[PDB]
């Protein structure tokens, strides 16, 4: 199997500084060959090195390359863009503005980009873009999308080299013979039902081949069109159940495999869970939740411990919303599991004129008292100074951290006015770092044995700049005498992590 990453879903938003953004990009796509989500390259500057991108072979979602000023972006081996998710509802590849004068994004040598399964392409305002105006997109993009193609190439820099004469129709991704465009679709024969290796009908590729092939069989594809077995491309993974026509009954298939992205895998990897349709998801999120059945994670319908599943901020009906609001809070009524992330921001308590959102009444936070599970992360960057702890999450039991804040933190208590955390029911933080900082009145945070809550090896804690340990000792605000060395969420015996109430 290939080395995989998740990608990003930030669009044209910047993180921190240029160095911070570049650190996030590099730390996300380091040695990534299969991007399960979207490949977003934004705000790469000056002489920043991007040669770690040469390992990327396929992207499932879209590829957004915009607002950069680096002269080179070496996506030299990006073979296919599956386009399972579009950008601005149209494009699977979007090379938007990338000029500073006329210098920046000159070489885009995507030599092996030959398939865009879904969506269109948009090149818009790239003065230094050099050899992309020469590419025939009829070979790469499906015909169904050739109407939505918004190609723009008006070059102000005018310093671009000429294509190699060996490139057919002068079509090259960059200068040189290696940068010639490889036509594997529009230079085929009428007998070829898909891609091909050459003009003769003997060079047709298998139907399950995408972006060309090396032989005629289904184990010779460059990249599979649908699903990849160990070595064979298939239209579907081996089903988990097979129809028995003698007993008229669905039997268990011993060679069944779940769908992990575009591969067929005997077992869903960590931080993923099977569904009822035989596909690995990052987290159950419709009307289901995670269960340990047959010693394996499964998505089971909301019954028993689960009472109601609700979307987190950012997706679902809470999509394009920034935090929990006077209008958001009501829909969180009696939810027990959050399918996604949780955001609490100062704009929630100050209100927002741009969204016609009045201030959030603090008492309404009590609605979250039924939440016992969060698949994503919990981010609290604002809290009623009147309150002394996180009493809204008194019964919160587990944070899975399937989606993490900036790809790192699954819990983030920042700049609150609380004195204790009060997470009495919290018992598991599956994956993701924990940061607790700026809470100048918070005391017992450093007492907790966070290793007892972590499930994944390597999870870090950044608990700094709260209230001094000696300052809380000289005030009696310490863990109760009934507590255990594992720490406490507050001063009460019900706040101990062990020997609790």
């Amino acid at each position: 199997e290939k080395k995989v990453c998740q990608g990003t879903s930030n669009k044209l938003t910047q993180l921190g500084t240029f160095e911070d953004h570049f650190l996030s990009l590099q730390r996300m796509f380091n040695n990534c060959e299969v991007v399960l989500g979207n490949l977003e390259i934004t705000y790469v500057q000056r002489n920043y090195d991007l040669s770690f991108l040469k390992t990327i072979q396929e992207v499932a979602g879209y590829v957004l390359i915009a607002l950069n000023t680096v002269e080179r972006i070496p996506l030299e081996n990006l073979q296919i863009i599956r386009g399972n998710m579009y950008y601005e509802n149209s494009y699977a590849l979007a090379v938007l503005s990338n000029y500073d004068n006329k210098t920046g994004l000159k070489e885009l040598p995507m030599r092996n980009l030959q398939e865009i399964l879904h969506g269109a392409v948009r090149f818009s305002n790239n003065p230094a873009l050099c050899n992309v105006e020469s590419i025939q997109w009829r070979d790469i993009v499906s015909s169904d999308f050739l109407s939505n193609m918004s190609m723009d190439f008006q070059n102000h820099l005018g310093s671009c080299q000429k294509c190699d004469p060996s490139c057919p129709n002068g079509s090259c991704w960059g200068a040189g013979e290696e940068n010639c465009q490889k036509l594997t679709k529009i230079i085929c024969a009428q007998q070829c039902s898909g891609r091909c290796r050459g003009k003769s009908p003997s060079d047709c590729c298998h139907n399950q081949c995408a972006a060309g092939c090396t032989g005629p069989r289904e184990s010779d594809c460059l990249v599979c069109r649908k699903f990849r077995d160990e070595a064979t491309c298939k239209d579907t993974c081996p089903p988990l159940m097979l129809y028995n026509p003698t007993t008229y009954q669905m039997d268990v298939n011993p060679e069944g495999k779940y769908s992990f992205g575009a591969t067929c895998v005997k077992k869903c990897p960590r931080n993923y869970v099977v569904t009822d349709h035989g596909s690995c998801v990052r987290a159950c999120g419709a009307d289901s939740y995670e269960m340990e059945e047959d010693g394996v994670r499964k998505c089971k319908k909301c019954e028993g411990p689960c009472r109601k599943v609700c979307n987190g901020i950012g997706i679902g009906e809470f999509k394009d919303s920034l935090s929990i609001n006077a209008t958001n809070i009501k829909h969180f009524k009696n939810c027990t599991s959050i399918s996604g992330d949780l955001h609490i921001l100062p704009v929630a308590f100050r209100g927002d004129s741009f969204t016609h959102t009045p201030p959030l009444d603090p008492q309404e936070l009590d609605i979250l008292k039924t939440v016992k599970e969060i698949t994503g992360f919990l981010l609290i960057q604002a809290w009623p100074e009147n309150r002394t702890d996180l009493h809204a999450f008194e019964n919160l039991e587990i944070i899975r951290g399937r989606t993490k804040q900036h790809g790192q933190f699954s819990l983030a208590v920042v700049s609150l006015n609380i004195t204790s955390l009060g997470l009495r029911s919290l018992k598991e933080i599956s994956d993701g770092d924990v940061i607790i900082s700026g809470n100048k009145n918070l005391c017992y945070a450093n007492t907790i044995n966070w290793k007892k809550l972590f499930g994944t090896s390597g999870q870090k804690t950044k608990i700094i700049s709260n209230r001094g340990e000696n300052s809380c000792k000289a005030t009696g605000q310490v863990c109760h005498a009934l507590c255990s060395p594992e720490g406490c969420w507050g001063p009460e015996p019900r706040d101990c992590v062990s020997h609790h109430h």
């Binding site: 044209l12 910047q14 938007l96 920034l322 704009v347 927002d352 004129s353 790192q408």
Partner: protein, 36 residues
Amino acid sequence: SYCINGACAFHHELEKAICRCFTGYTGERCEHLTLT
């Protein structure tokens, strides 16, 4: 009022308002506190 903690600048080619956040803020509308 769009950029909560940042300066607003319009990209007319993208037709989008980009918020350049301040010393310790981040996000699309500069609504998130920077996490170290």
